[PDB]
């Protein structure tokens, strides 16, 4: 007789649907998913170096809370704020709490190095039953309480040079006596005033006498202030009153360092995009999990799921 | 064509024949791995890494603080609206042109069979072509194998088509 | 950088099981296509087992079809291979290789890729 | 399954002197789908060549790769001491496959 042939492609019973320019919904024979909508759970001890902070914020450590003084000398990639976090120390608030904590969680070290101040007047290393430190009283590790000695508090007028090649961060702050009575018994001038100065930079503060809430026994405070010092550049501390004097630096380094907030426990794997929801894998162009993103990560969008068809137009009978 | 064959599971594209010997089944290799080929580089495209970012800014808050939280946010928020559409837009394009290519590739398989059969054959318009010859499994896959010679078969299929 | 680092191996009888593993550093294991490569004492190259970035699909050489299975674990950023009533021939150095292009691959005859990075090596001898 | 065939058994050359190593199909390729590993001994194989005439990164300007079809050959310009070693070729084009291998040695 005669011969047939036939072309055609291949089909499946159960295909994918996809999205095009035009149709909404279209059947072809595979897609994969480009929307990353999953993790593990837990944050990845590699590569990255992972710091939990457990029980202490990053400032707390910063500035040497008693139950955050294992973090002394510490170093991360990325410094995980657990919401359990709190403070057990002197009554604090900082200015611009959000830029020292950034700035901090940016130069990825707490290494602290000690510096001779010379205090010639007053009465260095107070204390306090809010700040508890072993047996009794005590304060931040990384802060001098000045007071008078004897019955005065002369004008403390010291200098330190920054000579090295690096950035020297500066922590200190003032205090904010509840009454007269403890303002004079303390600090004998009757309004303190603290000016701490570089070359290019100057700020100054006076304090201010009044009643607080009550908090861990007091209702005084401490505003914690920072100073920045370049190389050649010099710091100058004036006060006759009220100072809370730094007893040196942190050094100041630039790199892929920050913090994030996060309750996900740590796990021993690896993986390089970190979340709050914990580590996801970025093989995927987008993710779905959280905006809050550390590493090479997926770009976060809106959808859930993104099918690429990765085949041909299904269609059966 | 009309519609595929749930029955072919070794390859995207072939022939079907009936014959003089029986019916047969056999994928075409060249234009499957053509049509591989592309959505392969397709993936290569999309999955090629991401962008290295550490530091950023914060994108949750816990106090009301006005025209700062609400720079951080908007700022987010933008942000988000255009790597979605971008996104969006992406897996339209990629599935239109994906569908786009594997029914043109069968289109240039049909098209490379026709030149094949001079005019030895008609198409019926079946996605099929009637064959005037005889045409064991020897016959046929030698078309398949692109191995099949026209002259031959002229005169004998010139013949059954022509009275 | 991009590391392989195989673990694992060691000597085991004939017919017995055995698992070895591959811990990638450097780049998503999820994101590439990956191959183990073996290599008998003296002799040279031979391929043994692919799984694409999906885990979508997996293929063999014949000489360990039905007896060798490959695997990952997104969680934990690492390579499997489960190998099954081992013996004599199986006796080699087994890779652990990382392919930047294949991606998609659905049948077992279609074109893979080349070996972009190679991890160093962990030793299989089988022997009674 | 596509045989990869590599001559010579053995390659011999002095220090300084120009090598070529041939590697041939049993059907053809792909795509030029065709890989150059080199291995020296104790160590892991590095890649050379992909897609028969692409230099992997890193990879001197000396080594260099041609060919299509079912014959390509690795050219290696000036031999340094440092070139001694078993080269293999690799095929993609279809499913994967090795060659057999070319041990290249000093003659003196």
């Known amino acids: 007789s005669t011969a047939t042939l036939c072309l055609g492609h291949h089909a499946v019973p159960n295909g994918t649907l996809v999205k095009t320019i035009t149709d909404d919904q279209i059947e072809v024979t595979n897609a994969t998913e480009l929307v990353q909508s999953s993790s593990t759970g837990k944050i990845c001890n590699n590569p990255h170096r992972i710091l939990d902070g457990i029980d202490c914020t990053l400032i707390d450590a910063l500035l040497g809370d008693p139950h955050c003084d294992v973090f002394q000398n510490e170093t991360w990639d990325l410094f995980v704020e657990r919401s359990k976090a709190f403070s057990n120390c002197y009554p604090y608030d900082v200015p611009d709490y959000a830029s020292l904590r950034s700035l901090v969680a940016s130069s990825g070290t707490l290494e602290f190095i000690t510096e001779g101040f010379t205090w010639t007047g007053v009465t260095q290393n107070g204390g306090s039953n809010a700040c508890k430190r072993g047996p009794g009283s005590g304060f931040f590790s990384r802060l001098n309480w000045l007071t008078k000695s004897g019955s005065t508090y002369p004008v403390l007028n010291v200098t330190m040079p920054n000579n090295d090649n690096f950035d020297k961060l500066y922590i200190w702050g003032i205090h904010h006596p509840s009454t007269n009575q403890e303002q004079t018994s303390l600090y004998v001038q009757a309004s303190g005033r603290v000016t701490v100065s570089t070359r290019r930079s100057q700020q100054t503060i006076i304090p201010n006498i009044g009643s607080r809430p009550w908090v861990r026994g007091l209702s005084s405070r401490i505003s914690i202030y920072w100073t920045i010092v370049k190389p050649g550049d010099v710091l100058v501390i004036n006060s006759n009153g009220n100072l809370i004097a730094p007893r040196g630096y942190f050094k100041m380094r630039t790199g892929k360092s920050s913090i994030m907030r996060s309750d996900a426990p740590i796990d021993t794997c690896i993986s390089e995009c970190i979340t709050p929801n914990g580590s996801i894998p970025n093989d995927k162009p987008f993710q779905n999990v959280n905006k809050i993103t550390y590493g090479a990560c997926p770009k976060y969008v809106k959808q859930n799921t993104l099918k690429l068809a990765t085949g041909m137009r299904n269609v059966p009978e | 064509i009309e519609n595929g064959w749930e029955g072919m599971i070794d390859g995207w594209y072939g022939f079907r024949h009936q014959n003089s010997e029986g019916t047969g089944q056999a994928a075409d290799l060249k234009s499957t791995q053509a049509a591989i080929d592309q959505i392969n580089g397709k993936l290569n495209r999309v999955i090629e890494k991401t962008n290295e970012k550490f530091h950023q800014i914060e994108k949750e808050f816990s106090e009301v603080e006005g025209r700062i939280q609400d720079l951080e946010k908007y700022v987010e928020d933008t942000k988000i609206d255009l790597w979605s559409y971008n996104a969006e837009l992406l897996v339209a394009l990629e599935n239109q042109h994906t569908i786009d290519l594997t029914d043109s590739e069968m289109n240039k398989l049909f098209e490379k069979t026709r030149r094949q059969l001079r005019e030895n054959a008609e198409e019926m318009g079946n996605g099929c072509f009637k064959i005037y010859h005889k045409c064991d499994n020897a016959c046929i896959e030698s078309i398949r194998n692109g191995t099949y010679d026209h002259d031959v078969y002229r005169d004998e299929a010139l013949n059954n088509r022509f009275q | 950088q991009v590391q392989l680092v195989e673990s694992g191996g060691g000597v085991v009888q004939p017919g017995t099981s055995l698992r070895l593993s591959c811990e990638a550093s450097g780049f998503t294991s999820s994101a590439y296509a990956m191959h183990w490569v073996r290599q008998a004492p003296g002799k040279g190259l031979e391929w043994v087992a692919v799984?694409?970035?999906?885990?979508?699909?997996?293929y063999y050489a014949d000489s360990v079809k039905g007896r060798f299975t490959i695997s990952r674990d997104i969680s934990r950023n690492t390579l499997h291979l489960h190998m099954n009533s081992l013996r004599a021939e199986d006796t080699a150095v087994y890779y652990c290789?990382?392919?930047?292009?294949?991606?998609?691959?659905?049948?077992?005859?279609?074109?893979?890729?080349?070996?972009?990075?190679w991890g160093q090596g962990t030793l299989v001898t089988v022997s009674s | 399954d596509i045989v990869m065939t590599q001559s010579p058994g053995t390659l011999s050359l002095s220090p300084g002197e120009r090598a070529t190593l041939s590697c041939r199909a049993s059907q053809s390729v792909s795509s030029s789908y065709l890989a150059w590993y080199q291995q020296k001994p104790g160590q892991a194989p590095r890649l050379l060549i992909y897609?028969?005439?692409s230099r992997a990164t890193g990879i001197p300007d000396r080594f260099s790769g041609s060919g299509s079809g079912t014959d390509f050959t690795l050219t290696i310009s000036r031999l340094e001491p440092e070139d001694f070693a078993v080269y293999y070729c690799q095929q993609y084009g279809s499913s994967f496959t090795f060659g057999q291998g070319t041990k290249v040695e000093i003659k003196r």
């Open positions: 290789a990382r392919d930047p292009l294949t991606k998609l691959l659905p049948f077992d005859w279609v074109s893979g890729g080349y070996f972009d990075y």
């Open positions: 897609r028969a005439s």
């Open positions: 799984i694409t970035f999906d885990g979508g699909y997996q």
